[PDB]
Symmetry: C2
Subunit: 825 residues, 2 copies
């Protein structure tokens, strides 16, 4: 016949709601009955009554430092709640959540006086302080506020309450949770109470402060949130697998029927095992179960994200000592300088029941060690100083010295709910609004003459500038080496960033040329369009790049073979070539294949022309260059996941360890528009693309899930194959290498290799030889591979080297290819 | 399948949420595309594209002053919403709700600059203002804040928004809702915008200010509330039964599926009929659906409560307009003195499509009309002076002079959700805690030496202090007359009011003596109890009230027949006495029956003693007095309920109007502790007990519902009955009048009557004769009712009047009874 009481946010309360709350607490404070505040406050600690109120010695009263701590305080809150429902509150016990960052202590808690808006009569605010009746009629609770409460997020840093609550919500075991949970809860006792004798910081006098119940309203809310989490994870939220022995022992003093606890329902559900079902048993709800505005789903995702990182903790073993105290620990390396670690607090009183935690209470020091430039396994110690409520050093003998525990990263897939503008999608799938946004954006970026502008970022690739501005005689980008992929990843990110700066809600799209295409995609090919908002006709920003120091626009002379490269269907050399690339389980072995095939598209779309995609020095000026590299980057993305699928390394590579360590030249300089690319300049850092903040929808090749990709790759390794190996290097210009096999003197159609380069080039030499399989070619000509080993049967390889210059053709410089027979294993 | 966007409260936003929002809007503002801010803001008004973007003359653009106003703007918001979701906002469009009273303008709107907490980078706040690009490039929106924004509830009065928001939600037809709903929405346009030309108050430029959208996120929410309300009532929420003509016509410019709207879902759902299902079609939710913290259930309860009241409205027929305007009306009586009436605003521009409401926009004037002490149908006029946006006074001819409408009170039962401590309960149903609460409070109250204290409030009835001290020579309480019930209603209230003042969470219990009782209920009967909290034994506060000026404690000498009077239990004289009381459909007829039965109990528990319940002058000092009057008051409450059921007057009476008008003497005096009893000292005010704020656990007699009571009452009238009529009046002392019918000098057991009085009394004469039916006594006596008409047959009536003091006894100073034959009909 009656609906649940709702515990609203304190600052959510209306004038009508506040009014009833204040008047209700006012009456239940003047109420000398057991239903009154002095009496309810007495349940917690100081006038002790819990062994039994008649006992000679009383170690009473409340449960602290044990798994049953949350239940006692839940039921204790419903005790206080039922009282002011009956004393006329229209709402349940409000909470202020420390889940959000703090600016001020709540008004209804701090304001000395209260004016009833409806009667206009100013009165003392019942929530400002509590009276401790038995000591003196004139003994008020008092408070002292720590700056710790009002902490705000820094650049990388997050507030103490945010971090430790999440570390608590992180737990999947109740007892593990409860330990972290309780000590987080100790904070506001510690931060509002302070050094003051009759306060939240003293176990005895705490419940006499009205704040206690607004506080623990939120403590209980956190537990429900954690309960909600356990339901979400398919775990037992309403039961406890650990500490089962304590779930039977009924909650005192509530367990006392007859004269001491008059509330019927509270007595009935005195077993902590019955306190689990709060909504059915005690009939109260929360308006919102949110941790800092996060949904239970948003919460769990965050948690799982945090679990993926490599984390190291400090562990403390906590035993009660009969007083409240504040703990400070520092991280100290072998070198003298010590840095400030963190803090935690204990709640305590002289009549506290002795307690000992059966677990380690963990605190996270990972961000601190990372700033200390020292890893988890390297020589650092923790010193801890703990002051009493009194307050003087405890000293140091009290708590066993802290332990340190690192948790290894756990490799598992995540949601990860990337923003809508940071996802790179197939250029064919783009909607019209995606098109207009991009085209409007790129024009502004090109017209941008600042350092963020298109001219400058185009210059990072092909201008004559690296290694340093004054010295070269050199070209800046990275080819052809293991860190080639890495360089163009930042470069692409740098482009994405500059785009958003001019209103791009669309990440740079990728054109998939591995699929059959009769023509260039419209976004890249189309010359002009009619804007409707002006009567003006605008030229497509994606089809023409201006090179300001050469006074020329880029040119695209598209070789007929590009469209003809991939018409299998699915039987395309380009498909087969890429599949051979995916096969590689080594990053370096994968990289050469990746870059050579990447050279192909450069050559064929801009060929036989200077100031084109074919020309390494100027290719970055053509806006397709970026659309192109969004594709090769995605091809890498597929491979990283392919590797992750095979358990082989994805985030790291055992290659170019001298390279991977060092940051990349054009980006790290002080002369860089955005701080973000400067930050991630190092190859090791940008190995994984998710941490960089973008993603591809989606990662799959020709309608094959990654399970299917590896499946056919295993199928290709099962057949005997023959390769031609090419050791490639810088020839200071672009070229096409044609390969053709001769059975005797007759030679037809073996294959083609493209090499990128420029007049201004960075001299490069490949660590190994690029492969291209002639397996299917030999089957076509009935030249059996085993006959390759035969001296009588004569086969030869001929290369036709023709530079971009046209033809020219070029004398034979590059090392001649090698035959590789790869038996199936 | 992407998760719904949530429209959060502004103040609820986390730092991360504010961050993603600010950067997103920052981007989409620099977005020159159609997806950008400048283009979307155009959709509303000034660069006018709406008839079609290419027309010579363009009536553009947004729908205003018509039924489909909410659908256009709902769709308009999802337009703006999807932009910044795609521009990277993690949350939906925040709302700023005026449902709560205002103190300030919300933060992300009012701060000129914003510093990213995470990067430490200070930037200009994108929500502070908007750019109007087609005017000068350095042209921004500005604001001007009216005092009206920050209105707070003072005494009985409530803020403009609260009053008028609810008036809108009150509506049951969509069109009637919409008309009120929209003028409400116009307030913040007028209040945030002000005199400024480029502001929210000018139709043209409003949407260029981002504040518009936070505003209209709440506007939509309010409609969703109203939708949710209509769902509660079993009415159509997702359809509109009125203005079906308009619901078909697609919303422009959204309707344009061309370069003008590149949003797919927006074009598809450009039908305003399609705009209703927001969650399915547009995929956005609200964090909470609450009007000033009130739930939808709480809302309708308030709304229904307001429908029971008698209300009068001023009506305005709104056609417009050249511009935005501010309207002001005053209420003026026959005499010249004017009071401030409310105000309202309209939104407009030079390019607005002509509009006319087909109904009256209602404003409420009931509260203020009362302050002018004049009724609705009487001699008063409304003059309105309306000033424009420029603003020259607009000619009275511009808007038709206002009309005035009175909406009659709708009599139907309500919820009404009364506080727990203000419920008066059957004394036997009380739990152990209510008992302890009652006692502790009464102890404090009797101890209380203040004017709020028991000595002073009990002195109100039994003194000797009626107007004017020290003239009396008089005695104050009101017996015996129609206003007897009224006087003792306030008295009981005054008693409750003072009890709460000492921590009583329990309203005064009623003890039902119509039910058979072996002894007095322990709350009244038990002498002492042992408090467990203090080792002391305390005596029950409910017996032996102390009388200060007589230095004597009251005594209860209980006559043996009181418990024996009700041995029926339905056959009990008391049930039959009360059932006869309920039968009266006139108030005064009801009053005499009630007050005589009232005297019966007063007399029998404290009989034959001075300083007792039987003594009129000192009955008030015995605590059980108040428990008794809780019972008779409940009897009156049931009677009132019956009158309502019988469709006869309940809240009013056609009896003595001389007495009903004047305030009552002990309470109205400036020498009264609490202002609440002073105000309601008038008998007219006290008629409905709910308006006073308390209630009874249930209104039912002997297991009969109020329907069953009237059913049995009709049953009794269906038989022939014989009464004896006693005209009673003030003799200066209490006495008991025994009725005895004698056939022929043989007399036995006819009935009994009691009358209350004291040395210090208020002289009283009853308006009628008390009736008591002897019909059952006669049928036992085998005396035919028709033999009463026989002169030949011998029967007569004798009264042996004995004083309260045994015997003493008194001579016959009261008129002898009259025989009344009531033929059944
Ligand atoms: C201040 O507080 C500390 C913490 O309680 C006191 O330390 C305890 O004092 C009791 C005697 O009252 C001893 O029996 C305990 O062994 C002490 N425990 C510890 C850990 O010190 C301390 O005595 C107090 N001193 C002052 C100056 O107030
Ligand atoms: C485009 O259409 C006409 C011009 O072709 C513009 O309106 C007028 O056209 C008539 C002839 O049909 C002329 O006599 C008027 O002098 C024109 N008026 C103006 C103001 O140009 C029309 O304005 C044009 N559409 C717009 C508004 O851009
Ligand atoms: C301010 O606005 C009002 C109307 O918004 C102006 O009055 C309008 O004047 C035009 C003539 O140019 C009339 O056609 C309109 O009917 C008028 N509006 C109404 C309803 O009165 C007024 O002139 C403006 N004030 C100034 C001087 O700027
Ligand atoms: O309540 Cu027992 O301490 Cu937080
Ligand atoms: O590699 Cu330098 O960019 Cu295609
Ligand atoms: O809606 Cu167009 O005006 Cu606020
Ligand atoms: O009537 Cu004034 O006392 Cu019961």
């Amino acid at each position: 016949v009656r609906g649940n009481l709702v515990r609203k946010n304190v600052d959510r309360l209306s004038l009508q709601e506040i009014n009833s709350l204040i008047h209700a607490l006012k009456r239940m404070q003047k109420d000398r009955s057991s239903d009154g505040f002095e009496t309810i406050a007495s349940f917690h600690a100081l006038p002790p009554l819990c062994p039994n109120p008649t006992a000679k010695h009383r170690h009473a009263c409340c449960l602290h430092g044990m798994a049953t701590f949350p239940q006692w305080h839940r039921l204790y809150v419903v005790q206080f709640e039922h009282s002011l429902n009956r004393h006329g509150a229209i709402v349940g016990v409000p909470y202020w959540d420390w889940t959000y960052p703090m600016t001020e202590v709540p008004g209804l808690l701090t304001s000395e006086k209260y004016t009833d808006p409806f009667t206009g009569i100013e009165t003392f605010n019942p929530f400002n302080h509590g009276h401790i009746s038995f000591i003196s009629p004139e003994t008020m609770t008092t408070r002292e506020v720590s700056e710790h409460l009002f902490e705000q997020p820094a650049l990388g840093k997050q507030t103490w309450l945010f971090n430790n609550i999440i570390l608590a919500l992180e737990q999947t075991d109740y007892c593990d949770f409860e330990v972290q949970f309780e000590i987080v809860h100790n904070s506001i006792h510690s931060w509002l109470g302070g050094k003051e004798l009759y306060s939240l910081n003293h176990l005895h006098y705490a419940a006499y402060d009205p704040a206690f119940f607004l506080h623990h309203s939120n403590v209980d809310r956190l537990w429900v949130v954690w309960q909600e989490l356990q339901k979400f994870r398919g775990l037992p939220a309403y039961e406890s697998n650990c500490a089962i022995e304590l779930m039977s022992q009924p909650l005192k003093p509530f367990s006392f029927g007859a004269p001491y606890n008059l509330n019927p329902v509270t007595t009935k559900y005195s077993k902590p095992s019955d306190v689990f079902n709060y909504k059915q048993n005690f009939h109260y709800e929360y308006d919102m179960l949110e941790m800092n505005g996060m949904s239970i789903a948003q919460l769990e995702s965050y948690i799982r994200q945090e679990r993926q990182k490599d984390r190291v903790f400090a562990g403390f073993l906590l035993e009660g000592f009969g007083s409240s105290a504040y703990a400070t620990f520092q991280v100290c390396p072998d070198v003298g300088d010590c840095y400030e670690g963190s803090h935690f607090s204990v709640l305590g009183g002289s009549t506290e029941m002795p307690w000992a935690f059966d677990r380690l209470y963990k605190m996270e020091i990972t961000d601190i060690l990372q700033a200390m430039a020292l890893k988890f396994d390297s020589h650092f110690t923790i010193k801890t100083k703990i002051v009493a409520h009194n307050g003087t050093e405890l000293p140091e003998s009290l708590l066993p010295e802290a332990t340190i525990v690192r948790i290894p990263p756990s490799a598992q897939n995540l949601e990860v709910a990337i923003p809508l503008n940071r996802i790179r999608r197939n250029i064919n799938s783009l909607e019209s609004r995606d098109v207009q946004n991009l085209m409007s954006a790129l024009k502004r970026l090109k017209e941008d003459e600042s350092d963020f502008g298109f001219q400058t970022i185009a210059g990072y690739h092909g201008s004559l500038m690296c290694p340093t501005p004054e010295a070269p005689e050199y070209a800046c980008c990275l080819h052809g080496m293991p860190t080639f992929m890495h360089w163009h990843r930042v470069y692409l990110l740098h482009f994405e960033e500059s785009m958003r700066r001019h209103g791009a809600s669309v990440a740079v799209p990728y054109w998939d040329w591995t699929m059959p295409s009769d023509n260039l995609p419209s976004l890249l090919g189309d010359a002009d369009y009619y804007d409707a908002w002006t009567d003006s006709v605008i030229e497509n920003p994606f089809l023409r790049g201006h090179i300001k120091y050469e006074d020329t626009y880029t040119v695209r002379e598209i070789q007929p073979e590009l469209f003809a490269l991939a018409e299998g269907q699915k039987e395309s050399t380009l498909f087969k070539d890429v599949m051979l690339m995916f096969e590689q389980e080594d990053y370096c072995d994968f990289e050469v294949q990746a870059e050579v095939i990447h050279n192909s598209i450069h050559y064929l779309i801009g060929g036989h022309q200077k100031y084109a995609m074919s020309s390494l020095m100027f290719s970055s000026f053509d806006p397709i260059f970026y659309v192109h590299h969004s594709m090769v980057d995605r091809l890498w993305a597929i491979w990283q996941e392919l590797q992750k699928h095979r358990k082989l390394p994805h985030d790291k590579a055992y290659c170019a360890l001298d390279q991977m360590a060092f940051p990349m030249k054009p980006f790290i300089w002080e002369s860089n528009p955005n701080p973000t690319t400067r930050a991630v300049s190092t190859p090791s850092k940008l190995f994984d693309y998710k941490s960089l903040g973008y993603d591809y929808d989606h990662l799959n090749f020709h309608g094959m899930s990654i399970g299917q990709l590896e499946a056919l790759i295993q199928k290709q390794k099962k057949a005997d194959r023959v390769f031609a190996g090419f050791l490639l290097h810088g020839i200071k210009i672009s070229a096409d290498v044609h390969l053709k096999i001769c059975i005797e003197a007759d030679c037809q159609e073996a294959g083609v290799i493209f090499v990128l380069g420029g007049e201004t080039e960075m001299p490069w030499h490949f660590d190994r030889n690029y492969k291209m399989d002639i397996t299917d070619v030999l089957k076509k000509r009935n030249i059996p591979p085993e006959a390759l080993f035969e001296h009588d049967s004569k086969i030869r390889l001929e290369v036709e080297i023709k530079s971009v210059d046209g033809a020219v053709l070029d004398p034979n410089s590059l090392p001649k290819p090698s035959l590789i027979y790869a038996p199936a294993k």
